[PDB]
Amino acid sequence: TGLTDDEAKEFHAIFMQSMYAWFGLVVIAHLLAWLYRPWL
Amino acid sequence: AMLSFEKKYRVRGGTLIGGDLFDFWVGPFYVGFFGVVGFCFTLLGVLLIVWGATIGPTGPTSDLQTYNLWRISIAPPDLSYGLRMAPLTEGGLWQIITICAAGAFISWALREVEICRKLGIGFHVPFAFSFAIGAYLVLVFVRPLLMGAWGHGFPYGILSHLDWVSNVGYQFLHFHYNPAHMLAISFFFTNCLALSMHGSLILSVTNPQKGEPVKTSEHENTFFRDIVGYSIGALAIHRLGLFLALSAAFWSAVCILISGPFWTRGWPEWWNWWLELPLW
Amino acid sequence: PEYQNIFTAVQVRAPAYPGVPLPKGNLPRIGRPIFSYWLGKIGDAQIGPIYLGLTGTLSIFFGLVAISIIGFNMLASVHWDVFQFLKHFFWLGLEPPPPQYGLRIPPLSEGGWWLMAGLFLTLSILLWWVRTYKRAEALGMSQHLSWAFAAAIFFYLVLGFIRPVMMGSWAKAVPFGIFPHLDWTAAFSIRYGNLYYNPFHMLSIAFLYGSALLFAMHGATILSVSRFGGDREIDQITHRGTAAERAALFWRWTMGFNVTMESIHRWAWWCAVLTVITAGIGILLSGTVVDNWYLWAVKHGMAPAYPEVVTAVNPYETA
Amino acid sequence: SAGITHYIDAAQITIWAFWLFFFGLIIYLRREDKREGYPLDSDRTERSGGRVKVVGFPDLPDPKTFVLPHNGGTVVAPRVEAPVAVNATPFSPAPGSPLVPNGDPMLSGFGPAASPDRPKHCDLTFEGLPKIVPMRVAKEFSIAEGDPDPRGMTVVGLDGEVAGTVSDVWVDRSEPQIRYLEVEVAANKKKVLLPIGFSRFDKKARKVKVDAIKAAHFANVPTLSNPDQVTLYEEDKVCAYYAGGKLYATAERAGPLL
Amino acid sequence: SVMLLGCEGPPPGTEQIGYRGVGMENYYNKRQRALSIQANQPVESLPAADSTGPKASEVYQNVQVLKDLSVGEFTRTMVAVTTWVSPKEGCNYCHVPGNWASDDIYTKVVSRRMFELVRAANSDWKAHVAETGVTCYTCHRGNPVPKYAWVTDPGPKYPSGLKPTGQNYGSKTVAYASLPFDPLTPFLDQANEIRITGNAALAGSNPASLKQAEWTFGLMMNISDSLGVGCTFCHNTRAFNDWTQSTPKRTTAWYAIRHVRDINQNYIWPLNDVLPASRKGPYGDPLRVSCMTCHQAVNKPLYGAQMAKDYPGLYKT
Amino acid sequence: FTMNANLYKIWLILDPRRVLVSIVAFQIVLGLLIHMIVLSTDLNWLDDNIPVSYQALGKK
Amino acid sequence: TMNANLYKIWLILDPRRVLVSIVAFQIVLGLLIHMIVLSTDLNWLDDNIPVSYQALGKK
Amino acid sequence: NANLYKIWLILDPRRVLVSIVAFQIVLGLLIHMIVLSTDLNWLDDNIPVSYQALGKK
Numbered sequence A: 001t002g003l004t005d006d007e008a009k010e011f012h013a014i015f016m017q018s019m020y021a022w023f024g025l026v027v028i029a030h031l032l033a034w035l036y037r038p039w040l
Numbered sequence B: 001a002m003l004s005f006e007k008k009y010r011v012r013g014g015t016l017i018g019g020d021l022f023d024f025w026v027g028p029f030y031v032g033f034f035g036v037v038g039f040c041f042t043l044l045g046v047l048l049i050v051w052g053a054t055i056g057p058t059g060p061t062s063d064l065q066t067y068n069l070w071r072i073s074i075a076p077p078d079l080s081y082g083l084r085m086a087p088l089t090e091g092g093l094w095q096i097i098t099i100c101a102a103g104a105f106i107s108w109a110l111r112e113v114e115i116c117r118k119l120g121i122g123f124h125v126p127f128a129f130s131f132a133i134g135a136y137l138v139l140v141f142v143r144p145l146l147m148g149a150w151g152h153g154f155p156y157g158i159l160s161h162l163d164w165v166s167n168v169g170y171q172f173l174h175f176h177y178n179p180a181h182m183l184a185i186s187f188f189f190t191n192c193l194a195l196s197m198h199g200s201l202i203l204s205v206t207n208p209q210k211g212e213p214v215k216t217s218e219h220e221n222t223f224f225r226d227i228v229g230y231s232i233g234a235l236a237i238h239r240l241g242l243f244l245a246l247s248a249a250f251w252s253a254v255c256i257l258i259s260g261p262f263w264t265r266g267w268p269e270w271w272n273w274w275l276e277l278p279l280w
Numbered sequence C: 001p002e003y004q005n006i007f008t009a010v011q012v013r014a015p016a017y018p019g020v021p022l023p024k025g026n027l028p029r030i031g032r033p034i035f036s037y038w039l040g041k042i043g044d045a046q047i048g049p050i051y052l053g054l055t056g057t058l059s060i061f062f063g064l065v066a067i068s069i070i071g072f073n074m075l076a077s078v079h080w081d082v083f084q085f086l087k088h089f090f091w092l093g094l095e096p097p098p099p100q101y102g103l104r105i106p107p108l109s110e111g112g113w114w115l116m117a118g119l120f121l122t123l124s125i126l127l128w129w130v131r132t133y134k135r136a137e138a139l140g141m142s143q144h145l146s147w148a149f150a151a152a153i154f155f156y157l158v159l160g161f162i163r164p165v166m167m168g169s170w171a172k173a174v175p176f177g178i179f180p181h182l183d184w185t186a187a188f189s190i191r192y193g194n195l196y197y198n199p200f201h202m203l204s205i206a207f208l209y210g211s212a213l214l215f216a217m218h219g220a221t222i223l224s225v226s227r228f229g230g231d232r233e234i235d236q237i238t239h240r241g242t243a244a245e246r247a248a249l250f251w252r253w254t255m256g257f258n259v260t261m262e263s264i265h266r267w268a269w270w271c272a273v274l275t276v277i278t279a280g281i282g283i284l285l286s287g288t289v290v291d292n293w294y295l296w297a298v299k300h301g302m303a304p305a306y307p308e309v310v311t312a313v314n315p316y317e318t319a
Numbered sequence D: 001s002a003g004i005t006h007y008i009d010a011a012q013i014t015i016w017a018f019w020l021f022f023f024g025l026i027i028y029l030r031r032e033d034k035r036e037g038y039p040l041d042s043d044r045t046e047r048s049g050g051r052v053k054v055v056g057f058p059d060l061p062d063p064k065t066f067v068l069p070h071n072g073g074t075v076v077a078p079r080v081e082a083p084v085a086v087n088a089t090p091f092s093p094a095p096g097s098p099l100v101p102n103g104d105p106m107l108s109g110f111g112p113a114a115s116p117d118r119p120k121h122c123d124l125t126f127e128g129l130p131k132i133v134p135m136r137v138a139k140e141f142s143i144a145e146g147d148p149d150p151r152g153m154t155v156v157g158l159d160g161e162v163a164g165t166v167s168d169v170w171v172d173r174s175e176p177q178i179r180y181l182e183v184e185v186a187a188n189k190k191k192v193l194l195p196i197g198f199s200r201f202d203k204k205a206r207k208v209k210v211d212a213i214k215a216a217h218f219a220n221v222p223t224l225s226n227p228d229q230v231t232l233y234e235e236d237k238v239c240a241y242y243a244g245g246k247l248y249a250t251a252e253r254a255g256p257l258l
Numbered sequence E: 001s002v003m004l005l006g007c008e009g010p011p012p013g014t015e016q017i018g019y020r021g022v023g024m025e026n027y028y029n030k031r032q033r034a035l036s037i038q039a040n041q042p043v044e045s046l047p048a049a050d051s052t053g054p055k056a057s058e059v060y061q062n063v064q065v066l067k068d069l070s071v072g073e074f075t076r077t078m079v080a081v082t083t084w085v086s087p088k089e090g091c092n093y094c095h096v097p098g099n100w101a102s103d104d105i106y107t108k109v110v111s112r113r114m115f116e117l118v119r120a121a122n123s124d125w126k127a128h129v130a131e132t133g134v135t136c137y138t139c140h141r142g143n144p145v146p147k148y149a150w151v152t153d154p155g156p157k158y159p160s161g162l163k164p165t166g167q168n169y170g171s172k173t174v175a176y177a178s179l180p181f182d183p184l185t186p187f188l189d190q191a192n193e194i195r196i197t198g199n200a201a202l203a204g205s206n207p208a209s210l211k212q213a214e215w216t217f218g219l220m221m222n223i224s225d226s227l228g229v230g231c232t233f234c235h236n237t238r239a240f241n242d243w244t245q246s247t248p249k250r251t252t253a254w255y256a257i258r259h260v261r262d263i264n265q266n267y268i269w270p271l272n273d274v275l276p277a278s279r280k281g282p283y284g285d286p287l288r289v290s291c292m293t294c295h296q297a298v299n300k301p302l303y304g305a306q307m308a309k310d311y312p313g314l315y316k317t
Numbered sequence F: 001f002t003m004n005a006n007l008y009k010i011w012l013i014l015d016p017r018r019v020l021v022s023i024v025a026f027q028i029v030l031g032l033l034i035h036m037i038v039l040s041t042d043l044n045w046l047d048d049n050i051p052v053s054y055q056a057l058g059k060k
Numbered sequence G: 001t002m003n004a005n006l007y008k009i010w011l012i013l014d015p016r017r018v019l020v021s022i023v024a025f026q027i028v029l030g031l032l033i034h035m036i037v038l039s040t041d042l043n044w045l046d047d048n049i050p051v052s053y054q055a056l057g058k059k
Numbered sequence H: 001n002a003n004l005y006k007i008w009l010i011l012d013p014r015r016v017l018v019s020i021v022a023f024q025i026v027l028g029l030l031i032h033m034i035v036l037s038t039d040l041n042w043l044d045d046n047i048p049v050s051y052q053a054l055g056k057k
């Protein structure tokens, strides 16, 4: 809390793009290792 | 003699079970109805024991009999004479001493009380001391009884009394796993930590940095509110203390009252009830 | 029948006091201090906030690492099966390197994690002593904790860097688990004579006692005369009063001599420090010095002598 | 070790070490022990011990300089002190004999209810305002959410019969702990500070019994100079009174039971 | 994970092993010492022997262990060597339906050896086994397979190929404690040194890894447990090594810890071949012999009752 | 949610902050708890079966 | 999908708690991986190749 | 990289800073170890030659 609707939606947006920043950098991470050393 | 300000507290009386007779001082000690008795036992011990030092193992002649604190020790009677007066030479004497020492701590203990009264103070002191007193009974009385043997207690050896534990301790192999001994130990530790803090802090506020004011609680109550985050408080420390210690004792007390008359297997085992839990 | 200061009967509260502000360098304190009626029914019910500098974090970090090792490797043991991890908890642990790599970096397996984790409970522990002297005087406070902390931290190193590494043995250094650690002390007593004979232990004891004794007295004493602001020692140290009047007097007409609302707090800080001091002493001698303290003892005329109702035989001689 | 000289090695040296510096530091303390209250007063008896030195084996230490807080004089120790009065008569001339509290002991200000004359300046908080104050100025406070508010609890003599009631419970800016309770007595219609330390709570009947002094004694209770704050001097002053009650409030108490 | 007060009501046992007031003492719960006896009871021997007759190597096609025995006496043996062993399965347990000279049964093969075991023992290690000697009832106590054997403990599960330490666990093997949890195999089976006390006060002698005495412990634990007596019993604690200080019992245990070396590294071990899997261990092995195997938490299996004395064919001739 | 439609009410007695945050943790832990309890005995793809060759075969 | 109605999230949940809690979780969790994995067969440090440059060079 | 700047308006930069510095100090002290312990103990074991083995002897 501590905020209104305005400042709220703005955060959420940028905050997302930053999260997909991870998933992508980590998924691409996994994949690179997946190719090298296959787990399972 | 008297302290700079003691001269003004030595009221008259305040005694417990009588004592308005010997209700006076000597040097800086109040006598009363207990400072008197305790003394008796003291010499009829501190010296009665000397006889022992004299006598020794075999006899006062045996090359075994010595006069080195490190070795001198009065040994309790054989488990033979169960709950009966043993021959001083064979055991009784030991009992005798122990007989005394009991009162000498029961007197001085009470004497403390009369005092606590005179100086119109709180009695936390004696009450505390009692535990410590007790732990000495439930470790040469409460136990040996539930073992039918007086000689089944411990010795009075400068270091000799050490082994007495060494054995009775191993009598359960890894005594260490005794649930009590664990906690009771833990306390005798925690105490030796908080103490190493309070007595430290204080001596770090009343005598702080160079060219600095005798700091106030407004620091103390934050000193740890910073390092560790929270501060038990000031009044508190003088609580947690007695707590820890007055517990540690009473604990250990349990610790060896149950070891034997309440448990015969090696402690390590006791710890089994755990394992066998219908779960893991 | 007088309210014996047991648990602060009726309590009261006022806003969160974030302590005296700090100079130029001491980062902002942190936390939104809380209250707990219960905790508070014993002491300052307020909770926090707490400081966190560099060593503050730096140390804490180096802390929850060894834990995340000595913690991990341990769980691994009972093949990541918590259920038993929960069962064989008090038994589990993480042992040091095998006598081979006496000092060499143990492999990622054989006692490796322990040397790893160890060093991280070697720094963070030493770093936290910094998180004291630092946050200590930056309060305008002298140093007596920082001091003792060493005395203690000394002994800890007498159980590692200074001795285990002093005898070339990534083994001679205590394990890492309640029981096993509970065993190391056991094992030790044996491997070398029987500690009950190394004075510096039979010594370090009397202390662990005294503290168990004194801070146990003065804790009461204070209380006894806590009505007369005894608890307020602070000032009593400066401006005396009936507190230190009634108190010390007690011990005066008791054990004779006595001292001051100041002095005591001294012996306090002392017995304490003079404990871990004597601790690490014996533990340091015992190893690279005397090998059997029992022999030592008697060889010095120390160890006692009793009769002999039982004795045995010796295969290595008759056979 | 008791005989003389036997074995000879290294470690046994060190045991001598510590067990030497100990007997040194032991003295250090001794001295530091003596700061206040020294030297002794009378000759009712001599120094009990091995070596009966003039006044304590460890030569009294030197003056210590206590730099008090802002707006505060400076204290030192040792620091010669001006002899006090002894409102009492020795039951016996014998050294070590007790001193009877002439007149009314309850206030005769002796032993069971004696006290020193601490500075007559209310001990303040961190910045300035005085620590111990009544809940009057202590308006920024609040009873512990839960604990039954003592404001309105009728005090009750150790004799049982009522003895006034309460008012403001003197809190503190340093530690949210109650240290005193205003007791608007019954006969005096005045205000007598109640030392919580001596106040036993009875949250069941709104009462607050104090087995320290009879209901009446609340009249002889040292009166507070100012009601909005109390100085160290009196901080000891109010207390010491009730204290006496412990050995005065009844002929019984003081005298032995068996 | 909680504080406790003894779960046994007093008063307990009371053996004064040492001088009046010195240490070594022994405490036991009567309420158990009881059952444990009323349960660890010996089965009365067979009626008198024949004394008559020739031998058995004579009349019987093949009888090597009991050749000197008169038919009758010899038969007593078979009967005994049945009730002591598998009186559930009958004679056929060690024999083939009819043809009794057959050695087509691994049970017999070994049974044979078990004989060379007992006797050899009963006569050559009488210093440990003394006059009570041992029978089949001992380890087999009315059971074909001794409930008290011991295959080298594998240890607790392995974390992805990674769990070398063999100390931390807690296993009845050691009265319960984080210890080797298998001091046996490297001791009772093999024969790793057991001493660790430094011979001289100062250093420059015993370079034994603490870890080494760390193992002796476990062992010692087990031992102490097997018989069921605190280390006080054989030791003078402060003097775990000073024999001159120990008690008779000690030495009397010394050998034992070798008669077993024997029994395992000489008998129960070899016979692994004829032994199926169901008696083999994971690391591939033969349920050897712990002190517990016989003792079963007692000082003289069946508390001194001497069954073996009533059987002449159970002593090396 | 045939019945869990009239639940709307709950929120006032169940603080949002208390219920939201606290449950996101119970999950954050159990997450590991399961994977650990299962990873422990059931099957261990990590050291259960191939690919586990490179470790032994690929090593020396 | 989720994002549009998920900005309202920060309307009850403080930005600091999420920013602080997540870092702590991602790293400790990240660590408990290579970690629990490293000790697993697919170890990479001392397990297999490249060619035993240690075994070769050493001796 | 564009929008990443706004983070400084809610979190104390000094905090994250000292937070990061302590994080990279242990890790590095960790890694060099977590590796030097297993992967390749480049310090003692393979090179350059054994001045101690072939020398001391």
Ligand code: BCL
Pocket: B101, B105, B131, B132, B133, B135, B136, B138, B139, B164, B165, B166, B167, B168, B169, B170, B174, B175, B176, B181, B184, B185, B188, B248, B249, B251, B252, B253, B254, B255, B256, B257, C185
């Ligand atoms: C066999 C070796 C075993 C072992 C066997 C035992 C045995 C056996 C016992 C203990 C007991 C105790 N052990 Mg252990 N213990 C071991 C290892 C440890 C370790 C350790 C770090 O390794 C620790 C910390 C402890 C800690 C403890 C304490 C919890 C406990 C109580 C001590 C005590 O203060 O009684 C407090 C005692 C008193 C207050 C009485 C003395 C004071 C009297 C009243 C006054 C004397 C006045 C004098 C005569 C007058 C002259 C004036 C002079 C100036 C003094 N043990 C090993 C594993 N332990 C004991 C226990 O549990 O007791 C309850 C006990 O019996």
Ligand code: BCL
Pocket: F020, F021, F023, F024, F025, F027, F028, F029, F030, F031, F032, F035, F038, F045, G009, G013, G017, G018, G019, G022, G033
């Ligand atoms: C068992 C054999 C399989 C396997 C089978 C499974 C199965 C079956 C499941 C998983 C699941 C998971 N497994 Mg898996 N898994 C395997 C191997 C792995 C390996 C590995 C290195 O080998 C890893 C790293 C993982 C990792 C994971 C996680 C991604 C996932 C959920 C974890 C969790 O509890 O968080 C928990 C939750 C929370 C912290 C919060 C709740 C979530 C909510 C909706 C949104 C948060 C809202 C919040 C209030 C808003 C603020 C935002 C921020 C918090 C600030 N698995 C093997 C191959 N795994 C689970 C899964 O992923 O389901 C989809 C699952 O069911």
Ligand code: BCL
Pocket: A018, A019, A021, A022, A025, A026, A027, A029, A030, A031, A033, G019, G022, G023, G024, G025, G026, G027, G028, G029, G030, G031, G034, G037, G044, H007, H016, H020, H031, H035
């Ligand atoms: C196991 C087999 C492979 C391998 C496979 C993988 C795989 C697969 C992955 C990694 C990943 C990582 N590996 Mg690896 N790795 C191997 C061997 C190694 C070795 C080694 C010495 O041998 C090392 C040191 C590492 C080290 C690392 C880390 C650098 C990295 C992240 C872990 C993490 O928890 O992030 C957790 C994250 C955080 C705590 C931070 C939060 C992230 C957000 C987006 C940023 C915060 C925003 C904030 C508000 C802004 C302020 C900025 C600053 C904080 C001031 N690997 C072997 C060879 N490794 C992971 C990775 O790098 O993905 C990209 C990954 O997915």
Ligand SMILES: CC[C@H]1c2cc3[nH]c4c(c3C)C(=O)[C@H](C(=O)OC)c4c3nc(cc4[nH]c(cc(n2)[C@@H]1C)c(C(C)=O)c4C)[C@@H](C)[C@@H]3CCC(=O)OC/C=C(\C)CCC[C@H](C)CCC[C@H](C)CCCC(C)C
Pocket: B038, B041, B042, B043, B044, B045, B046, B097, B098, B100, B101, B104, B105, B108, B109, B112, B125, B126, B128, B129, B130, B131, B132, B155, B156, B157, B158, B159, B161, B245, B246, B247, B248, B249, C209, C210, C212, C213, C216, C217, C251, C254, C255
């Ligand atoms: C948790 C409680 C701790 C504690 C508390 C405690 N001790 C106390 C007190 C308190 C509160 C006191 O008030 C009292 C005190 O000092 O009052 C001024 C005291 C005290 N604690 C003392 C000792 C002591 N406390 C110990 C421990 C503890 N005391 C605990 C740690 C220990 C040990 C070994 O750990 C000892 C040795 C005394 C100095 C003093 C009580 C003095 C007293 O009453 O003495 C009476 C008797 C004599 C002076 C003469 C002795 C003559 C006897 C006939 C001989 C007895 C022989 C003895 C049994 C053999 C000893 C040989 C051993 C080496 C085997």
Ligand SMILES: CC[C@H]1c2cc3[nH]c4c(c3C)C(=O)[C@H](C(=O)OC)c4c3nc(cc4[nH]c(cc(n2)[C@@H]1C)c(C(C)=O)c4C)[C@@H](C)[C@@H]3CCC(=O)OC/C=C(\C)CCC[C@H](C)CCC[C@H](C)CCCC(C)C
Pocket: B189, B190, B192, B193, B196, B197, B227, B228, C059, C060, C061, C062, C063, C064, C067, C124, C125, C126, C128, C129, C132, C145, C146, C147, C148, C149, C150, C151, C152, C272, C273, C275, C276
């Ligand atoms: C005679 C000296 C006595 C003594 C003195 C002493 N101890 C001291 C000091 C002193 C003077 C300090 O100044 C220091 C202290 O408290 O400073 C504030 C301290 C201290 N004594 C301590 C412990 C301690 N002292 C002991 C003993 C003693 N200390 C002696 C009796 C003992 C024992 C063995 O009895 C212990 C266990 C610590 C409380 C503290 C030193 C703390 C320290 O160095 O911490 C470094 C940092 C960390 C360990 C990081 C912690 C990580 C997180 C904050 C916690 C997260 C949870 C945790 C990982 C649990 C696992 C959960 C998982 C699921 C994640």
Ligand SMILES: CC(C)=CCC/C(C)=C/CC/C(C)=C/CC/C(C)=C/CC/C(C)=C/CC/C(C)=C/CC/C(C)=C/CC/C(C)=C/CC1=C(C)C(=O)c2ccccc2C1=O
Pocket: B042, B043, B046, C210, C214, C217, C218, C219, C221, C222, C243, C244, C247, C248, C249, C251, C255, C256, C257, C258, C259, C260, C261, C264, C267
């Ligand atoms: C051959 C030969 C020599 C033979 C010997 C023959 C002999 C001598 C025979 C005689 C035997 C006899 C009768 C011996 C008894 C003699 C007597 C009476 C000895 C005194 C007994 C006694 C209990 C002495 C004290 C024991 C000691 C030193 C215990 C140490 C424990 C310890 C550290 C105590 C601390 C003491 C202190 C400093 C107390 C003061 C003190 C404390 C504790 C506060 O808490 C406090 C709180 C607030 C304000 C002030 C104070 C304060 O001043």
Ligand SMILES: COC(C)(C)C/C=C/C(C)=C/C=C/C(C)=C/C=C/C(C)=C/C=C\C=C(C)\C=C\C=C(C)\C=C\C=C(C)\C=C\CC(C)(C)OC
Pocket: C067, C068, C070, C071, C072, C073, C075, C076, C115, C118, C119, C120, C121, C122, C156, C157, C159, C160, C161, C173, C174, C175, C176, C177, C178, C181
């Ligand atoms: C899987 O784990 C999860 C994720 C579930 C988290 C849980 C973790 C848990 C529950 C962890 C629990 C840990 C416990 C219970 C630990 C208990 C530890 C105990 C009881 C320890 C007791 C004693 C320890 C001692 C004495 C340690 C001493 C260590 C020393 C002396 C280390 C010294 C290191 C040095 C000197 C390093 C020097 C650097 C080098 C080696 C390079 O110098 C050559």
Ligand code: HEM
Pocket: E059, E060, E061, E062, E063, E064, E065, E066, E067, E078, E079, E081, E082, E085, E086, E090, E091, E092, E093, E094, E095, E100, E101, E102, E108, E111, E112
């Ligand atoms: C009560 C039923 C049993 C009977 C009637 C019986 C009978 C016999 C007979 C007649 C022989 C000698 C045969 C020969 O080789 O010529 C013999 C030998 C033998 N029996 Fe049995 N037996 C019985 C039970 C057992 C059991 C239960 C065992 C198992 C341990 C056993 C073990 C042996 C052995 C080892 C020999 C060889 C003797 C030696 O080498 O000294 N028998 N038995």
Ligand code: HEM
Pocket: E081, E084, E085, E094, E106, E107, E108, E110, E111, E114, E115, E118, E134, E135, E136, E137, E138, E139, E140, E144, E145, E146, E149, E268, E275, E278, E279, E287, E288, E289, E293, E294
């Ligand atoms: C002289 C009397 C004894 C006889 C006749 C006897 C007979 C046998 C037989 C027939 C077996 C194999 C059972 C099967 O699996 O089919 C066996 C196994 C065994 N015996 Fe004995 N035994 C005797 C005494 C003992 C004693 C005194 C011990 C104890 C130290 C002992 C220890 C064992 C062990 C450890 C096994 C292996 C367990 C198995 O594979 O079943 N035996 N014995």
Ligand code: HEM
Pocket: B173, C190, E193, E194, E195, E196, E197, E198, E213, E216, E217, E220, E221, E222, E223, E224, E225, E227, E229, E230, E231, E233, E234, E235, E240, E241, E249, E250, E251, E253, E254, E257
């Ligand atoms: C569980 C408690 C026990 C512990 C901690 C223990 C510990 C030890 C230690 C450390 C040694 C080696 C001393 C040296 O030479 O350096 C030892 C030897 C010995 N112990 Fe024990 N012991 C225990 C119980 C027993 C019991 C109950 C017996 C008796 C049956 C026993 C019999 C022996 C014997 C005969 C030796 C010397 C021969 C040898 O094993 O190498 N011990 N013990």
Ligand code: HEM
Pocket: E128, E129, E130, E131, E132, E133, E134, E138, E188, E223, E227, E249, E250, E252, E253, E254, E256, E257, E258, E260, E289, E290, E291, E292, E293, E294, E295, E299, E300, E301, E304
């Ligand atoms: C290493 C493990 C073993 C140790 C340390 C050990 C130790 C001892 C000791 C010290 C005694 C004498 C007790 C006393 O004097 O009252 C004893 C007696 C005895 N042991 Fe063992 N033993 C072990 C293994 C065995 C085994 C494997 C057997 C079984 C075949 C066995 C059978 C017996 C018997 C029957 C007695 C009683 C003798 C008598 O009544 O005097 N022991 N043992």
Ligand SMILES: [Ca+2]
Pocket: C095, C175, C180, C183, E167, E168, E214
């Ligand atoms: Ca270990």
Ligand SMILES: [Ca+2]
Pocket: A039, A040, F044, F045, F046, F047, F048, F049, F050, F051, F052
């Ligand atoms: Ca796989």
Ligand SMILES: [Ca+2]
Pocket: H040, H041, H042, H043, H044, H045, H046, H047
């Ligand atoms: Ca290298």
Ligand SMILES: [Fe+3]
Pocket: B198, B199, B202, B238, C218, C222, C233, C265
């Ligand atoms: Fe204090």
